[PDB]
Amino acid sequence: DFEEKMILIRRTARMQAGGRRFRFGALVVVGDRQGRVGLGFGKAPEVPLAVQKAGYYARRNMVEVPLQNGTIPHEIEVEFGASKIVLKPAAPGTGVIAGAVPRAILELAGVTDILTKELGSRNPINIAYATMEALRQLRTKADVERLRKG
Amino acid sequence: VKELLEAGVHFGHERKRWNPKFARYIYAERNGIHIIDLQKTMEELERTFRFIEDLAMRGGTILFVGTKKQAQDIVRMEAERAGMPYVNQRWLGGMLTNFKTISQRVHRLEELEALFASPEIEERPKKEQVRLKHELERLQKYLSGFRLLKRLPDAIFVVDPTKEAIAVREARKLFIPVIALADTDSDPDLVDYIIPGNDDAIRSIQLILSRAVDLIIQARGGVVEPSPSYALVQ
Amino acid sequence: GRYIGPVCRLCRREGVKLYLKGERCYSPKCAMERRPYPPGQHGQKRARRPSDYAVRLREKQKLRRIYGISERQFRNLFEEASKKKGVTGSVFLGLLESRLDNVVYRLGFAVSRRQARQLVRHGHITVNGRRVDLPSYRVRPGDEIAVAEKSRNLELIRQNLEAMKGRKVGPWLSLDVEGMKGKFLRLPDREDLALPVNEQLVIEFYSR
Amino acid sequence: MLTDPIADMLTRIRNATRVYKESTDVPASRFKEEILRILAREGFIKGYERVDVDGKPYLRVYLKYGPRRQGPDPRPEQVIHHIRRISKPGRRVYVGVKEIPRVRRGLGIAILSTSKGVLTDREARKLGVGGELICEVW
RNA sequence: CCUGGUCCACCCGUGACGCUGAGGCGCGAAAGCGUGGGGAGCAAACCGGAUUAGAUACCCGGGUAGUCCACGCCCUAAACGAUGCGCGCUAGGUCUCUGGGUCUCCUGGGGGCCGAAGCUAACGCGUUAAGCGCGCCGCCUGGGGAGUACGGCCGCAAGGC
RNA sequence: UAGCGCCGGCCAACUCCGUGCCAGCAGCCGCGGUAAUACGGAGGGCGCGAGCGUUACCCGGAUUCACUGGGCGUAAAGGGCGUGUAGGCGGCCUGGGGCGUCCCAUGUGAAAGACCACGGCUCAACCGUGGGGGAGCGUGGGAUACGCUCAGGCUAGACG
Ligand SMILES: [Mg+2]
Ligand SMILES: [Mg+2]
Ligand SMILES: [Mg+2]
Ligand SMILES: [Mg+2]
Ligand SMILES: [Mg+2]
Ligand SMILES: [Mg+2]
Ligand SMILES: [Mg+2]
Ligand SMILES: [Mg+2]
Ligand SMILES: [Mg+2]
Ligand SMILES: [Mg+2]
Ligand SMILES: [Mg+2]
Ligand SMILES: [Mg+2]
Ligand SMILES: [Mg+2]
Ligand SMILES: [Mg+2]
Ligand SMILES: [Mg+2]
Ligand SMILES: [Mg+2]
Ligand SMILES: [Mg+2]
Ligand SMILES: [Mg+2]
Ligand SMILES: [Mg+2]
Ligand SMILES: [Mg+2]
Ligand SMILES: [Mg+2]
Ligand SMILES: [Mg+2]
Ligand SMILES: [Mg+2]
Ligand SMILES: [Mg+2]
Ligand SMILES: [Mg+2]
Ligand SMILES: [Mg+2]
Ligand SMILES: [Mg+2]
Ligand SMILES: [Mg+2]
Ligand SMILES: [Mg+2]
Ligand SMILES: [Mg+2]
Ligand SMILES: [Mg+2]
Ligand SMILES: [Mg+2]
Ligand SMILES: [Mg+2]
Ligand SMILES: [Mg+2]
Ligand SMILES: [Mg+2]
Ligand SMILES: [Mg+2]
Ligand SMILES: [Mg+2]
Ligand SMILES: [Mg+2]
Ligand SMILES: [Mg+2]
Ligand SMILES: [Mg+2]
Ligand SMILES: [Mg+2]
Ligand SMILES: [Mg+2]
Ligand SMILES: [Mg+2]
Ligand SMILES: [Mg+2]
Ligand SMILES: [Mg+2]
Ligand SMILES: [Mg+2]
Ligand SMILES: [Mg+2]
Ligand SMILES: [Mg+2]
Ligand SMILES: [Mg+2]
Ligand SMILES: [Mg+2]
Ligand SMILES: [Mg+2]
Ligand SMILES: [Mg+2]
Ligand SMILES: [Mg+2]
Ligand SMILES: [Mg+2]
Ligand SMILES: [Mg+2]
Ligand SMILES: [Mg+2]
Ligand SMILES: [Zn+2]
């Protein structure tokens, strides 16, 4: 059903009289490679607990990606903080031309041919968030049609 | 299920410091205080109540929230005067949003209703005997109405969205329809079914909240006569 | 040169059966057959999660290590495939499937691809009549891959084209066992091939 | 004095929609009117009419939005998610029919002004002309 | 007394006469410079007392330039809102200064604070924008070397650009 | 005939011994002061193969001079302020011109190269033939929404 991908895991530290106190951050992608993708970022005392928490959170955050012959209905450029993502539609045979973060998402989203580009802050966390916002914003001829029918 | 000249209260409420959004529902300001346009109060009732009956005559569970100490009694009654649960005292963080958790409190309250009526009542010195005394006490004060909910309500009937803002926000988040009696100092856009009118003055809080339970009953066919809250209206 | 050396070791590193010996790779001995862990003093220790990079690298190797082509030629072919029309991944595979040494393999004139290659460089093969000793020679569609009479009487050719009797062959091909000749009918359609390779990943190893 | 009146209108519209106004006025001009004519036909606005504010000619631009949404922030989606001025005084932008751009794989439009009049990229392409790429809208 | 700017009302006159602005010219706190004058108090330098391990300081007693006026020069600064100017557009609340009105309030110009949408790395900004846009100028392009060297222009000099 | 580079991360490939902030490595981050996957060696491994590394240099990644495609409160960045020259920019309506702009046709745009197809050398590199595109500019004809210019008009900017 849903395939999970781990974007990254960081160790993060905090301070107390005595020393440092770690936590673990986990960014996890989940999708059915059939138009549904979810992002999840969970943290916990230990990695596993974190990951699991991430996965659990991903499923809580789903996006309905309007796949088309394997690509996206058009181009969007989304800015999440200092990270900017650029998604450009492509023909078949192209493949998923993207950095690891946007890829993992696009792939589990069902996207198969797409032109991508990371601009601004390359921060994986905000890039991944930038992506979901991009996809989430994709519209369709029918969608526009609906909106401008009035 | 009617009445138009209900100017017996409502309208004109909350000094000038409003919320421009609620401006659509305002008639005018006289000697300070915005006066809610009743013609519209009506219009909204019609639509809101519809949503109510429809979801009422379908076995819909509705949670009533009215902490405003002002109309803090006119709520539990009409609530109890229907299956409907209620939050009378204070709204807690997670009622709906952390429901699976806060439910453990209820699945603990009825858990004490037990002990406080068995052979174990006389156990452990007052030490562990008094800890569990207060244990109940409070629960029964906060979870008196939240007792009934066994799953997120199909809707929420808030009396003052602004006051009961945390609640509304949780409905919203969980796509739980939000019905609410609101006025001049609130963000209508957050109320799915608005009952624009006096958010204060028990008289007005009664007239509406009351009739709402009427239509709830009438819809559930079990037709009933007047309500016993008209007493606290003094 | 083209590798030359411990081969059922590549099989092991790639963790899958690569047929670089034809026979024996079917017997209870291809090593992949009982001893599946990669070669070297470390092959049995628990493996660490491979980097996306590692995957494509290994994936490209798997595919290339199959046809015995050099990174050089492999790369050039892929580039040609990219520039060409049609879904590159597909086109790439077909282009590889068009190498003469390979056809000589598909047709069975030889057990393995390496053996096949030698049969080409040694002139035992013919294309439309004239002999061709270029393992990398690209076969067009309609060409007649064959054995040169002067070679039809060699013990190896015999055992080989014999074992081919009754044995069926790729749908994009055709074989006349007695005439020791076959035909390259069509560029194999991707679906016709059943290689243990996800070529999409290869296209990606070369995009980086 | 307005510096770029078309840009003004483009912005007045942009702004007004972000706060979901019913309508919004803009000082009138044939040219602005002509663009509106397109915004309307393409269905980005419920349309527009000429009003006379405080004695002077304006153009009520009736805006259009999607429907109330679920969860928090029920504000409707925008019909006009984007509207950018392109050619501008001090960097005029022209294009040949061969250079007319395609806004969002067709899901959007580009309004250019041509000697055959103010057209969309579709219309322009049809009449086979090009011109000053006025703005982008989607 | 002489003189600049500016705000409101009336809607009276002109009829796009507008915005910005490289260079130019003018102004530009303090200290400093030149000539003359002035000099109560203060006070670089300096002369001493004390403190201290020392005390070329902080504390105390003195004290010159200077601080003041005139005329000329210098042109710098955390010269700050560390936020160039103009215009249009985008919830409100509250305090305040100044004007007009039908004056328990409406309307205009200014000063504050909170805050819609939105913006922002965040802090924050938010009709006095750091929002949404157009016009023009100025300026940045990792740190140290260095605001130095050289050259040029300016200045009596110190130095400035 | 088989060799060369590499195996701490970036970056594909790991263990023993030696050494002991030494000797040494090093593209960046860094590694060595007695357990070093980072030093030297060895076994083993990855990569490529008549090559493989190194050094230098150009473009890339670098939207890191940002036209596409950046910025300036506190990160580097608003000129100390004004006045104002050149210059850049310019409210609403009408008409003339048609300079910018757009359109059609035509000339030009050598060959080679690049791209596509087919063909010759057993293949390929290499080469042959044929095909297609092409900005810019010249010429002729045309359009007039926007910019421009000329003429008239207006009052919402500005000034009085
Ligand atoms: Mg880090
Ligand atoms: Mg940014
Ligand atoms: Mg990435
Ligand atoms: Mg960066
Ligand atoms: Mg291709
Ligand atoms: Mg452009
Ligand atoms: Mg007048
Ligand atoms: Mg006149
Ligand atoms: Mg000026
Ligand atoms: Mg001065
Ligand atoms: Mg002075
Ligand atoms: Mg003096
Ligand atoms: Mg003197
Ligand atoms: Mg003194
Ligand atoms: Mg002393
Ligand atoms: Mg002293
Ligand atoms: Mg300036
Ligand atoms: Mg105020
Ligand atoms: Mg007054
Ligand atoms: Mg004010
Ligand atoms: Mg004021
Ligand atoms: Mg906000
Ligand atoms: Mg901005
Ligand atoms: Mg924060
Ligand atoms: Mg604020
Ligand atoms: Mg430097
Ligand atoms: Mg340097
Ligand atoms: Mg200096
Ligand atoms: Mg001099
Ligand atoms: Mg590795
Ligand atoms: Mg080491
Ligand atoms: Mg050791
Ligand atoms: Mg190393
Ligand atoms: Mg070593
Ligand atoms: Mg070679
Ligand atoms: Mg470079
Ligand atoms: Mg560049
Ligand atoms: Mg650089
Ligand atoms: Mg730019
Ligand atoms: Mg920058
Ligand atoms: Mg600083
Ligand atoms: Mg700074
Ligand atoms: Mg300033
Ligand atoms: Mg400065
Ligand atoms: Mg001028
Ligand atoms: Mg004009
Ligand atoms: Mg004309
Ligand atoms: Mg004209
Ligand atoms: Mg012309
Ligand atoms: Mg031409
Ligand atoms: Mg040529
Ligand atoms: Mg040939
Ligand atoms: Mg040629
Ligand atoms: Mg011509
Ligand atoms: Mg004409
Ligand atoms: Mg005129
Ligand atoms: Zn094998």
Curated annotation (Swiss-Prot), chain A:
Residues 2-65 form the S5 DRBM domain. The keyword Ribonucleoprotein applies. Pfam families: Ribosomal_S5, Ribosomal_S5_C. One of its GO terms (cellular component) is small ribosomal subunit. The keyword Ribosomal protein applies. Keywords: Ribonucleoprotein, Ribosomal protein, RNA-binding, rRNA-binding. GO terms for biological process: translation. Coiled coil: none annotated. It comes from the Bacteria. GO terms for molecular function: rRNA binding; structural constituent of ribosome. PANTHER family: MITOCHONDRIAL RIBOSOMAL PROTEIN S5 (PTHR48277:SF1). Part of the 30S ribosomal subunit. Contacts proteins S4 and S8. Belongs to the universal ribosomal protein uS5 family. With S4 and S12 plays an important role in translational accuracy. HAMAP family: Ribosomal_uS5_B. The N-terminal domain interacts with the head of the 30S subunit; the C-terminal domain interacts with the body and contacts protein S4. The interaction surface between S4 and S5 is involved in control of translational fidelity. This is Small ribosomal subunit protein uS5. The gene is rpsE.
From Swiss-Prot, chain C:
The keyword Zinc applies. One of its GO terms (molecular function) is structural constituent of ribosome. Its cofactor is Zn(2+); [4Fe-4S] cluster. PROSITE patterns: RIBOSOMAL_S4, S4. GO terms for cellular component: small ribosomal subunit. Keywords: Metal-binding, Ribonucleoprotein, Ribosomal protein, RNA-binding, rRNA-binding, Zinc. Binds 1 zinc ion per subunit. In a number of structures (e.g. 4Y4O, 5FDV) a 4Fe-4S cluster is seen in place of the zinc cofactor. One of its GO terms (biological process) is translation. Zn(2+) binds at C8, C11, C25, C30. It comes from the Bacteria. Residues 98-160 form the S4 RNA-binding domain. It holds the Pfam family Ribosomal_S4. Part of the 30S ribosomal subunit. Contacts protein S5. The interaction surface between S4 and S5 is involved in control of translational fidelity. HAMAP family: Ribosomal_uS4_B. One of the primary rRNA binding proteins, it binds directly to 16S rRNA where it helps nucleate assembly of the body and platform of the 30S subunit. Binds mRNA in the 70S ribosome, positioning it for translation. Belongs to the universal ribosomal protein uS4 family. This is Small ribosomal subunit protein uS4. It comes from Thermus thermophilus (strain ATCC 27634 / DSM 579 / HB8). The gene is rpsD.
Curated annotation (Swiss-Prot), chain D:
The keyword Ubl conjugation does not apply. InterPro entries: Ribosomal_uS8, Ribosomal_uS8_CS, Ribosomal_uS8_sf. One of its GO terms (molecular function) is structural constituent of ribosome. Signal peptide: none annotated. Disulfide bonds: none annotated. GO terms for cellular component: ribonucleoprotein complex; ribosome. Keywords: Ribonucleoprotein, Ribosomal protein, RNA-binding, rRNA-binding. It holds the Pfam family Ribosomal_S8. SUPFAM superfamilies: Ribosomal protein S8. One of its GO terms (biological process) is translation. Belongs to the universal ribosomal protein uS8 family. One of the primary rRNA binding proteins, it binds directly to 16S rRNA central domain where it helps coordinate assembly of the platform of the 30S subunit. NCBIfam families: PRK00136.1. Part of the 30S ribosomal subunit. Contacts proteins S5 and S12. This is Small ribosomal subunit protein uS8. It comes from Thermus thermophilus.
